[PDB]
Structures are given as structure tokens and as C-alpha cells.
């Protein structure tokens, strides 16, 4: 039944109006109608982080990443949320996964350099930063 | 049935001097078990200690109808009538108590 | 169908016509159609009373009272029958029930005083007689 | 049936694009399809408030709150409407309920101070302003 | 309904100073009737006498939200905040009690 | 479950010496929930304060069977046996209490 | 269907004929037909006990006892198995339960005395032995 | 359905293993499936007899005798229980009934003599003993 | 259903009560209702063995072992019957298989030693006897 999808549109619309707090609860009903929707989980994860509600946002992102693998951008966003949460090692792991999925992603390399520098792997952080610069000199 | 639980709460409240709540407890019991003579008598007694002699009379009468041998209720009703100044009815019920 | 009630009217007519001995049988048929009728038993009690078969009039009144508690006049009439049966203790009890149900009717106090005089409770009888005189001036 | 939500979506679009006056009617149709919807009423409140038809926005917010209690956002928006209607006592009550729902909400404290100061409770207004500052100086 | 009988038991226990029982009884009552203002207020009062001032706050807040005119609840909530050392919230709620 | 409310009434009664009320309330509770070890133990305590040591024994035994580690129940059971003059069982259960 | 009990009969016959090792299997099939039968478990316990397979007999007795909590004799047999397994504390617990279920069981008191003596509770063991002797000197 | 007898068989087996206490329960379930079975009652009587619940066994014997009169064995087996209970008059009555049903039973005469001697009918007891001796000189 | 099993009980009874020759027929009736019963064949084996009709007992044991492998008891019994029949090689094979199924059994070692002594494997018979003496203290 199309109702399973309509709630996703409702959440997106509410997100466009900056009424995010209602958008999350709109996505929740869609999930409770169909827990297998990768798009619902991903959008909910990206909404929750804007409410400064981080840990649930990381949870939603991670649940999305199980439902469909290999999406190099979901890993990057989970890396951002983990980095904000201070779980720097797991954030480095996430950005490394992003690198593995797409070796040409310069943003992933920049974030990996940032997280490795924060984490104290100075040599590897510098290497990642240099790779990011070399991959996208226009960045 | 939980009517007995409510009645027990009423008895405990009355014996410890919480007449104000004993009334409510006995009411909760009675509205589910109207034939309970002891509950009616105790409710009348609670109103008596409270000084609401009209209600005490009204409930003592209902107790006596259900238990015509209840000498204690007769004595209480006579005293309540005396408090209301009906010395005639009070004397009648006191003599009834002596007879019983 | 109305048959369960029709016999009550038949008995009432016969009693109204001064044909009591058939009215009793009509009431009995009505009872056998429906033993719960509080109105059949009471009229049957009065009919048996006026035939001077008191021994069963008392029982008819008692059945009626059991089937329809908390009314004064039935107790009054049962008290009258008990009084004429010589069971003055039960008669005093019945008139007392009448007073307890309605503390304001002089007739019950008067007859209770009469029974108490015959029963030897002179002081209680005097109290009842005074209460009767106070409740109504004509009795 | 999904139409009950489709109308909400239509009104959301007509509020996103600047045609509020049609959005109100869309929400009204949605409500008449399903009066229990806690989101239709809540959005209609804001739409009517933006049209400056405050007298109706207050009632819309109140009905929404009745349909979904403890909403710390609906109470604040109703407080804003009530203040703009000049019924500052009800506004103070609304903001008090808001702060008592979310005791960490600095904005609720600031608004409570505002309405208290305009209402003449100078000491309480100062205390609320201090609370707002302590909870978040940026709010 | 039990929502009243259990509340009566709670009130009797609280009046007699047996707070350990009062808390549990009020909870058994509230499980059936969450809109009961006086129940929340008394539960917070019991926790206050027990000295669990923050939990007393947590329940006084719901007492006030369901009954915004409850001046006594505001007073006790302010006192609980003062016991928690939040002089600012305490003073605010005391002033609220005086205003109401 | 109303068993909880009845047990709470029993506990309140017992804490205030209303042993008749305690017995009746605990009994109302137990017939709803026979596996309640502490209810049996408290009922035994009530009968003990009454001096009805036979009933206290009969209920302390069930209390121990449902909770073999209950040292307090063992102590009171031994005391009841001594009150019954059974020095042997009394000593046995007191030693059990010390072991537990 | 009667087969569920016919298997119990078969096990009893085989045990009676002194062919226990097949009786155990017969009882097991009976149990798999109906796990709630107290007789099946209780008899299987003793059959396994006689085969010296104590490790299983203890659990069989426990499974039986969970289905007849106040059985005054299942506890005694479980106590014997536990004592032979060397779990003297649990054996003492079992015999205490046996005494508390039937205070007049002299055999239970004597066996509890034995277990306590082996367990080092010399004073309590002597008390139990004297109590058992008083209940019956031949047990 | 054959279960009503299967339970009797189970009780017999359990009695044959010397687990009488379970046999009694098996017989009781058999009875509850078919209360008119005389054989169940008789066997249950003789089981309760050896559990030494004498007065509980006497009632089972009596019910069995009621269910099939003239059973010369049941009367004697009831007489033994009554004699153990010391109700010697009823025991004498039972043994006399045994004599009436079968005047040639030497054992009945012997035990009737015993019961009469206990009961104080010395002459009749001697006569019964002589009758028993003459009936079976090989006894 | 159950009739297929009842005959096994009938044979067990007629073997428990000493009427083996009818028990064999009862078992045969059971088999002709279900050839696959591993318990009918095994019991028929020992029943025929006790009647000293060994030529059929060995066959019945072998069919049972075919229907239900790995049971050392059946192998040992078949070895006993083969020992009686004088097929010492097959008896030694049976006892060897019994040891290999359960290397801790002293009885199998003792039987193998006896059979190998008779068969002329003196050294292996002595080794088996020593193993039997080491495996159990009373055999």
C-alpha cells in the first residue's frame, strides 16, 4: 500500500520547512509500516543529526548501512556523526570503509586525514591529506 | 470479592481515627455489596464520630432494617436521635436496645 | 403473552365482586405461571387474610416481602396477621421494620404500641403511642 | 484511506510555495477527513498565524494540544499567539507549562520572562531571564 | 474502580507516616489513572519526605502540568529545587506559588 | 494485580498492630497468589503475635518450602516450635537459621 | 491418545523384568509424547539412578519436582541422588524440604542427620538424628 | 474408551513394583474416569490398606461392596481393616456376612472367632473357632 | 495405532509370568503388525534363547541388530548365542564389535578372552582377560 511510502514524502516536506522535529516523527511511522526501507532510515539519520540528537542519528545511519551495503556516502555521514560523538577510532574505520568503496573520493580522504590527526596517527593523517589533495586539486 | 478488601480498609481507617477516609472506603465497599449490615452500621458510626447525625441516622436505620437484632445499632441510633433532639425516638430506640 | 398477568385481573375482579374463595385460586394460577410476581403474592395474602386462613396469609405476605424488599405497607399487613396469630414478638418486629423504613407514619407506631402493651413492654408501648399521637393528630 | 494525508501534503506544498490562503483550506479538508490528526491541526495553527488571523490560530493550537499532550513546541507557539492576542495571563500559563515540560529549554524561559515583564511580575520575569541565560546564553 | 481504593490506601499510609507503603500504593493507583493530579502531588510529597528531592521534582512537574493552578505543588516543587541547590528555579517556583 | 494491593493493606495493618486486619488481608492476597513466600512469612508473624503458634507453624513451613534460604522464617519457626514445647524441632530450625 | 501412557506401561514392565536399559528409552518416548507427565519423569529418575547414571537422574528428578512441587518423596530421592553425587549442601536442602513438607517423616530426619554429619554440621546433625529417633527408632 | 482400564493396569503395575503411593493415585484417576468400576475400588482399598491409612481404606472397601454385593472376599478384606481399626462390632458383622454368603469358608469362621473373642462373646467365639476347625482340619 | 505395541506388553507379561512359549507367539504377532520394531525383535531373541531354540535366537538377534545399530547389549547377547552354537569365530567378532562400541566394558573383554581361549588365540585371550580384570574390579 502506497501509504508505506507517503510518510517519507511527508517527512521530506516537513524537513523543507525546517520543522525537523515533526519530520523525524513522520519518518518513524513509515519505518513502523515497513522497517526494510533503506531510504527512510537514511533520511531519518540525516535529520536527527541536525537536531543535535547525535547518538540516535548514528544508530539510524548504522541501521541503514546494514539494509543496503556499499553506499559510499552513507558511510561518510556515519563517519561525521561518529567524529562528532568523539568515537574517533570508529570514525576512522568508517572513513576507511568509504575509501575502500570509492578510492577516488577526495572528501573521504580529507575527513580521514582530519580524524587520523585527531586520533594521533600523524603520519597516516598527513598521507591521507596529501592523497585528498592529489585526488582533487580543485577541492 | 474486593468488597471485603474495601471494607477492611474502612475498618482499619476507622480504628485508627481516620473517619474522613473510613467513610469513602465503606462507600466503595457498600456500592458493590448493599446487603452488608456491618458496613452500614460502621458507616453510621463513622458519621456519628464526625458529628453528621442526620447521615448517621439514615444509615443506622438501613442497618437495623437488615439486622433487626442489632442492639448496638439500636443504641447508636437512639443516641443519634437524642443528638437531634428527638427524645421520643431516642427513648424508643434505647428501649429497643435494652430489649434486644 | 399477557396470560401471566390476566389471572391477576381475574382474581382482583372476583375479590371486588365478593367472591374471594375463587379469587384465591385465580391468584394461585397466576403464581404458578410466574412465581416472582410481587403483586400476586401480596393480594393473595390479603385475600387469604380476609378468608380468615391466617396461617398461610402470613406466609404469603412473607414471600411477597422477600420478593420485593423495602416497602412499609407489606410489613404493616404481615404485622397485623402475626398479631392476630398471637406471635406478638414477630408482630412487634414487623411493625418495627415498618417504622425503620418510614419513621414518619403514625399508624405503625400506634399498632406497635398496641402489640407492646399486649406484649408487656409498657414503657416502649407508651413511647410508641406518644410517637403515633405526635406524627398524626387523627390517630 | 490515504487521501486524508494527501490533503495534508497538498497544504504543505501550498504553504512552502507562498499561497497560504489555499493551504488553510487544504488543511481544513484534511481535518474534515480525519479530525483526530494531531499534525493537520498543528500546521493549520501556524498557517493561520502567518495570515494574522490570530483569533482562529489560538483555537487551532489549543485543539492540537488537546489531541496530543506534552508537546513542548505546541505550547510555545500557542504562547506566541496568545501574547499577540494580548491575553498575557494565558500566555504566561502556556510558557510556564512549556518550561515545566522541558526544564532545559532556554527559549521558553526567555519568553516567560518577556510575558511576565509585560504582565508586571518583574521579579519572576528577571528570574526567568536569568534561567534562560544559564540554560543557554545564545538563546 | 481500584484507581480510588488504592489511592485511599496511599492517603491513609501517608497520613500515618508510612511513606514506604504510600509510594507503592500511589503508583498502583496511577497505573490505571495517569490524569490524577492529587495522586502525582501526593507521590511527590512522599518522595519529598523520603528525601529523594530530584524524583519528587520529576513527579511535581507532572502534578503541575496537569493542574497549573496548584499553588501547593508549586511551593513544594520550589522547596525541592532548593534542596537540589537550584536557588534560581526554586525562587521562580516559590514566586509562582505566591502568584497562583 | 489486586494481590499487591491486598498485601500492602496487610503490611500496613501489621506494622500498626492490627493483627486481625493483617491476617484477613494477607489471606485475601494469598488465595490470589499462593507462590508469594513473603506473604506466608508475614502471615506467620501475625499468627505468632496472636500466640496462635499452630497456625504460625503451618504457615512458616510453607514460607520455608517456597524460600529455603529465608533465615528469618527459620528463626521464627524455631521460636514457634519452642512455644509449642518441641525443643527438638525448635533447636533444629534455629540451627538452620544460624547456618543460613 | 492412550499410547502416551502405554509407553509408561512398557517402561514399567521392562523395569519389572530387570531390563532397565530399554525401560529408560521407553520412558523417553513417553515423555516426548507428553512432557507434563509426573509419573514418567519420576520413574525415569529412579531407572537412571539404578543404572548409576546419576548425572542424568538428578535432572530427571528436578524436572519431575517442578511438576509436583510439594511431593514429599520426590525430594527424598533427589536428595539421595545428590548425596551420591557429593553435593552434600544441596542434599541437605532437599532433605530439609522433605521434613518441612512432612514433619513426621522419621526417615527424612535420619537422612538429613547423615548428610549434616558428613557435611560437618555436627550439632545440627545430632539434633536431626535425635529428632528422627524420637519420630521412629526403626527408621 | 480403554483409558478407563489402562489406568487400572498402571496402578496394578506400580503396586507390583512396590511403589504403592503412586498406585493409589493411578487408581483414583481410573475411578474418576469410571466411578462404577468395582475392581478399581477393591484394588484401591487393598492398596490404601498397606499404606496403613486404615480408615481411608475401609470406605473404599465399603463402596466396592456396595457396587457388587455378595462378594465374599471383599467382606473379609473389609473385616480385616475394621478389626485393625478396633470397631469390633462392625468387624463381627462383616465376618458374619462372610459366613452367610459362604457357610463353608473356614478362614471366615476362624477370624470371626478371633473378632468375637476380642468383642467378649467368648461362647460364640469358641463356637466359631470349633466350626473353623471342623470345616478345614487341614488348615 | 496402539495395537501394534500392545502385543509387546502381552509377550512381556507372558515372559514375566513363566509361560515363554506363548510369549514367543505374542511377539511374532507384534512383528507381523510392524516388522521394524527394534524392541520386539530384541526381546524375542532372549525368549527364544531361554527356550533353547538357539538356531532361531541368533537370527532374531541379528535382525534386531540390523534394525538398530551400535547397541552393545544386543551384540553381547548375540555373541552369547553364537558361543552356545559353537560358531566361535562369529562370537569373537561379536564381542570385538561390542568392545569397539564400548571400550570400557569389562564383560565384553571377559567374554572375548573366554571365546579366544576356546578358539586357540591364547595370547589374545590372555590380553582380553587382563583387560577385563583392569576394566572392572569384580569381573
Residue numbers in the entry:
A (entry chain Y), C (entry chain 3), D (entry chain g), G (entry chain C), H (entry chain c), I (entry chain 7): 1 to 139
B (entry chain d), E (entry chain P), F (entry chain Z): 1 to 100
Sentences from the paper on this structure:
Computationally designed multi-subunit assemblies have shown considerable promise for a variety of applications, including a new generation of potent vaccines. Here we describe RPXDock, a fast, flexible, and modular software package for sequence-independent rigid-body protein docking across a wide range of symmetric architectures that is easily customizable for further development. RPXDock uses an efficient hierarchical search and a residue-pair transform (RPX) scoring method to rapidly search through multidimensional docking space.
Given a set of prevalidated homomeric scaffolds with cyclic symmetry, we generated docks using RPXDock, and the resulting interfaces were sequence-optimized via Rosetta sequence design. To the right are representative 2D class averages showing different axes of symmetry and a reconstructed 3D map at 3.7 Å resolution. The overlay of the original dock (orange and purple) with the model built from the 3D reconstruction (gray) shows 4 Å Cα root mean square deviation between the original dock and cryoEM structure over 48 chains.
